[PDB]
Amino acid sequence: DGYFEPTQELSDETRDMHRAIISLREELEAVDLYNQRVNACKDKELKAILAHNRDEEKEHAAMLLEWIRRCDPAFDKELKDYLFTNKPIA
Amino acid sequence: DGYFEPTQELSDETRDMHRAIISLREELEAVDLYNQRVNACKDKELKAILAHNRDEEKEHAAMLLEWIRRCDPAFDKELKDYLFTNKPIAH
Amino acid sequence: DGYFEPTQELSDETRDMHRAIISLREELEAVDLYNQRVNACKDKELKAILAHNRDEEKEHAAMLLEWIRRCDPAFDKELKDYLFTNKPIA
Amino acid sequence: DGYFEPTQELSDETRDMHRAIISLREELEAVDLYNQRVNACKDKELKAILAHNRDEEKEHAAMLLEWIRRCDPAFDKELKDYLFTNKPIAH
Amino acid sequence: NDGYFEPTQELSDETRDMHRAIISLREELEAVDLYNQRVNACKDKELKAILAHNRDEEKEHAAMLLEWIRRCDPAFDKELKDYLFTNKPIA
Amino acid sequence: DGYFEPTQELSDETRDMHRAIISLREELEAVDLYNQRVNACKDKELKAILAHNRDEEKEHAAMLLEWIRRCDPAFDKELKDYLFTNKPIAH
Amino acid sequence: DGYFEPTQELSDETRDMHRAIISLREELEAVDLYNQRVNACKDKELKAILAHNRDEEKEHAAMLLEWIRRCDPAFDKELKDYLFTNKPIAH
Amino acid sequence: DGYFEPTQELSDETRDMHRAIISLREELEAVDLYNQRVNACKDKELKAILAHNRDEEKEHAAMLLEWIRRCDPAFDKELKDYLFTNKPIAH
Amino acid sequence: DGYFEPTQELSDETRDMHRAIISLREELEAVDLYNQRVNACKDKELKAILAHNRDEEKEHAAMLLEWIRRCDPAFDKELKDYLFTNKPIAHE
Amino acid sequence: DGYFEPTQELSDETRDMHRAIISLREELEAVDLYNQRVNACKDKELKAILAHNRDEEKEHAAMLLEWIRRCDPAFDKELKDYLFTNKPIAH
Numbered sequence: 001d002g003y004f005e006p007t008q009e010l011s012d013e014t015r016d017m018h019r020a021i022i023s024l025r026e027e028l029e030a031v032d033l034y035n036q037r038v039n040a041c042k043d044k045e046l047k048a049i050l051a052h053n054r055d056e057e058k059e060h061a062a063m064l065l066e067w068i069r070r071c072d073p074a075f076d077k078e079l080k081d082y083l084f085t086n087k088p089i090a
Numbered sequence: 091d092g093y094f095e096p097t098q099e100l101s102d103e104t105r106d107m108h109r110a111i112i113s114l115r116e117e118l119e120a121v122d123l124y125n126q127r128v129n130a131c132k133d134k135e136l137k138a139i140l141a142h143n144r145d146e147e148k149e150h151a152a153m154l155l156e157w158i159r160r161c162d163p164a165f166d167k168e169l170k171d172y173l174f175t176n177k178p179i180a181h
Numbered sequence: 182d183g184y185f186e187p188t189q190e191l192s193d194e195t196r197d198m199h200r201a202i203i204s205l206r207e208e209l210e211a212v213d214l215y216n217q218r219v220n221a222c223k224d225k226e227l228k229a230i231l232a233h234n235r236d237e238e239k240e241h242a243a244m245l246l247e248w249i250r251r252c253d254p255a256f257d258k259e260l261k262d263y264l265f266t267n268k269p270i271a
Numbered sequence: 272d273g274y275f276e277p278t279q280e281l282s283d284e285t286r287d288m289h290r291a292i293i294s295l296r297e298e299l300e301a302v303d304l305y306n307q308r309v310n311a312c313k314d315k316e317l318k319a320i321l322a323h324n325r326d327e328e329k330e331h332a333a334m335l336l337e338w339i340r341r342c343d344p345a346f347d348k349e350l351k352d353y354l355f356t357n358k359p360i361a362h
Numbered sequence: 363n364d365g366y367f368e369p370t371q372e373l374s375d376e377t378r379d380m381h382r383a384i385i386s387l388r389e390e391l392e393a394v395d396l397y398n399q400r401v402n403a404c405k406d407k408e409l410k411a412i413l414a415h416n417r418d419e420e421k422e423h424a425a426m427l428l429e430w431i432r433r434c435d436p437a438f439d440k441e442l443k444d445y446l447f448t449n450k451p452i453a
Numbered sequence: 454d455g456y457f458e459p460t461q462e463l464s465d466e467t468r469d470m471h472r473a474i475i476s477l478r479e480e481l482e483a484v485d486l487y488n489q490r491v492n493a494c495k496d497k498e499l500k501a502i503l504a505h506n507r508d509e510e511k512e513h514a515a516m517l518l519e520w521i522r523r524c525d526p527a528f529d530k531e532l533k534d535y536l537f538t539n540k541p542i543a544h
Numbered sequence: 545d546g547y548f549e550p551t552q553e554l555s556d557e558t559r560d561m562h563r564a565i566i567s568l569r570e571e572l573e574a575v576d577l578y579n580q581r582v583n584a585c586k587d588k589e590l591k592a593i594l595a596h597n598r599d600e601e602k603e604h605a606a607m608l609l610e611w612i613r614r615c616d617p618a619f620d621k622e623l624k625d626y627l628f629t630n631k632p633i634a635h
Numbered sequence: 636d637g638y639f640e641p642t643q644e645l646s647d648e649t650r651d652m653h654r655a656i657i658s659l660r661e662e663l664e665a666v667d668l669y670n671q672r673v674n675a676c677k678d679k680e681l682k683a684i685l686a687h688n689r690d691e692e693k694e695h696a697a698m699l700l701e702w703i704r705r706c707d708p709a710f711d712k713e714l715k716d717y718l719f720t721n722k723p724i725a726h
Numbered sequence: 727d728g729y730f731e732p733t734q735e736l737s738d739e740t741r742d743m744h745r746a747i748i749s750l751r752e753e754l755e756a757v758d759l760y761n762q763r764v765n766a767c768k769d770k771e772l773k774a775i776l777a778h779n780r781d782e783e784k785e786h787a788a789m790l791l792e793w794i795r796r797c798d799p800a801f802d803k804e805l806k807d808y809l810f811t812n813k814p815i816a817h818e
Numbered sequence: 819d820g821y822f823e824p825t826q827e828l829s830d831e832t833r834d835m836h837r838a839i840i841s842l843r844e845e846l847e848a849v850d851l852y853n854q855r856v857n858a859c860k861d862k863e864l865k866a867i868l869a870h871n872r873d874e875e876k877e878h879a880a881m882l883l884e885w886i887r888r889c890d891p892a893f894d895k896e897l898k899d900y901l902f903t904n905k906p907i908a909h
Binding site: 372373377384392400437445447452 | 464467522
Binding site: 004005006088089090 | 182183188203226229230233
């Protein structure tokens with residue numbers, strides 16, 4: 001999954017980017033999923049574990065994001081333009 | 091649809107958070123798939139289109155991420171810890 | 182994917198075409214998806230970001246489809262008959 | 272099915288636009304698929320059948336697209352920035 | 363998923379042309395069912411006519427395909443003989 | 454079964470026609486698939502089981518299709534105009 | 545589909561078993577699907593067809609399950625223990 | 636999930652038949668997968684674990700299938716004819 | 727299913743660990759599905775086979791995990807911190 | 819979404835168990851996927867991230883499974899049984 005072109009036609013660099021990105025996407029999905037489960041959960045202990053797991057995947061996502069940012073000038077530009085501001089995003 | 095719990099059991103703010111995450115996920119996927127296609131592409135004009143679109147999707151991602159950041163203090167703490175650093179992320 | 186035949190049995194031409202159509206299908210799907218999220222969205226700022234991404238995806242779609250017609254005369258004709266007209270599409 | 276938000280939370284014209292877009296995606300897929308089968312086909316008679324369906328689906332697409340165009344001015348603005356031109360698209 | 367459940371390299375050109383024909387038929391048929399459901403659910407009249415128009419030609423697309431199947435499948439042919447254009451109960 | 458619009462927004466007539474088409478599309482898939490397994494099969498006894506069930510599915514398909522055309526004047530018309538003929542089916 | 549390890553890592557035997565088990569799974573799903581479509585069907589003629597196709601496919605299941613037994617001693621044991629008995633299954 | 640019609644339109648005993656069939660299909664899949672895995676496996680201890688589970692799922696399948704036959708006389712007629720037999724299952 | 731990198735690119739070891747993990751996942755999925763079926767079932771006999779199959783799959787699961795614990799000192803560490811405890815699993 | 823039966827037919831306790839199990843399956847998938855990416859990765863910095871994330875997902879998993887143990891006596895049994903032992907697991 002994620003490979004839309006045969007791997008052997010892709011450079012190792014493109015494949016590492018693929019790895020980081022699909023990993024980031026999966027981390028984000030896990031944030032989303034844990035978060036819905038927290039909201040729907042009844043059992044307090046389970047709810048805490050889910051909110052906990054959820055918040056670690058945020059660290060995972062950030063780490064992958066930063067690795068992407070060091071390898072990708074066009075992305076680094078965009079993260080500079082929007083991240084850590086207070087102005088309207090729109 | 092990415093909705094793993096029935097929608098009627100999730101609040102407006104959870105649902106918006108979901109709209110944002112999945113939108114971000116789809117944008118990153120676009121970047122990845124566009125990158126793969128750019129690498130594999132033969133027609134030079136097509137190639138220029140795919141790379142143009144890939145770099146725009148980067149903009150969409152940045153925007154969605156920042157909105158997530160502004161109402162997610164836990165995500166915020168982490169991005170401030172790693173974004174724009176020079177040190178070994180994990181190593 | 183989107184490849185129903187082994188990639189190695191198709192020409193660079195059929196594959197560049199494939200690249201083009203699949204990208205356009207994904208840009209269209211995103212228009213549609215952002216449209217739905219815009220309608221159902223609550224937070225004004227998110228709705229604005231969702232609308233801004235969606236419309237930008239419209240530019241992508243349009244650029245990809247120009248590439249298609251410029252090397253597809255069977256399609257460039259269809260667009261010629263229907264696009265930018267007043268006539269009942271029927 | 273391609274509905275990512277509950278059907279009851281979407282207006283009728285959002286749902287018509289969805290029906291138009293998904294239909295257009297399907298036809299486009301058809302063109303792409305038929306193109307692959309054409310390229311990879313052996314039997315000459317099956318081959319002719321496939322290519323016919325294909326160029327026919329091109330019509331269906333053109334149809335849906337103009338219908339989308341009537342209804343979406345942002346989209347109209349864009350097709351009129353790019354269609355039937357001669358200048359490098361991004362390039 | 364290509365509808366190939368066995369490696370292509372282990373199937374003859376014939377089996378592969380047949381598969382091309384069947385999977386193409388399945389696809390036209392689906393678009394019929396889909397367009398059908400979309401016609402019924404549709405609200406906008408002009409969209410509706412287009413959806414109906416696409417659907418009927420996909421019926422032509424379908425019929426060409428199953429004829430091609432017939433001419434190169436004695437077992438299928440026989441069965442279409444037995445039941446098509448008929449009026450006795452189907453049991 | 455494979456429904457792109459909510460069941461409650463679809464008449465019983467459109468829903469039976471859907472039950473008919475999807476069943477047909479399954480039967481046809483089981484044909485294409487048994488045919489692949491037949492070509493790939495090593496064991497003789499299994500070969501025969503596979504081919505047996507394959508030819509029978511063609512009846513099931515037959516059959517369901519007759520049912521369709523009886524309530525689809527447009528599919529009826531496309532059938533008569535391509536089936537059992539010996540002309541080249543595409544230009 | 546159904547192959548979770550590369551086909552070139554599997555013996556012809558394992559692959560014929562796989563053929564048999566996936567085909568059995570498919571016949572069974574048909575029966576289930578046909579049974580739902582009967583439970584839900586409105587037109588009578590279609591119903592008879594659906595039930596007809598359904599019951600034929602149970603044969604296809606039995607034929608495959610037999611094939612499996614003759615070459616799976618461990619499966620041959622378990623079927624001897626439970627099938628055609630009047631004793632309770634579990635507790 | 637294997638429900639092709641809305642659950643609200645199926646009777647309870649159809650839903651129970653569905654539960655049986657789908658669980659049987661899952662147990663049969665686990666047999667197939669564990670078989671493929673045993674064939675490909677490298678570590679001896681893991682191998683034995685995979686082959687263990689595989690055999691027990693064969694039991695799980697036999698139980699379920701006894702349950703289906705005892706309330707589907709049509710599955711019975713066909714089971715009685717083919718199970719434990721010498722005759723070539725097909726020809 | 728399971729393989730996101732070409733198999734030719736992964737070691738026998740990584741691929742055995744993949745075989746163990748995906749097996750464990752399938753067996754846990756079997757438990758969840760049987761559990762849901764047990765809850766929704768309206769026939770006592772079927773219910774009993776459902777519930778039976780479901781409790782044996784717990785054992786399959788358990789064997790598979792033990793095999794993982796042995797080969798993965800990282801997984802062993804985490805299992806020892808939390809398994810058979812009484813304190814809150816979390817609140818962070 | 820992992821629900822095989824409508825959620826309105828499942829108790830809160832079956833749904834929490836579902837929430838636990840599926841979360842546990844996802845964290846295990848993560849381990850597996852990270853393992854494969856580690857093996858295939860080229861860039862050493864990314865690699866350290868992947869293995870970091872991977873080993874943290876192991877804790878997530880341990881946690882969930884400790885939760886399941888605490889309310890599944892048949893599970894808090896196989897685990898007392900097999901876990902932290904040196905016996906041959908199967909045969």
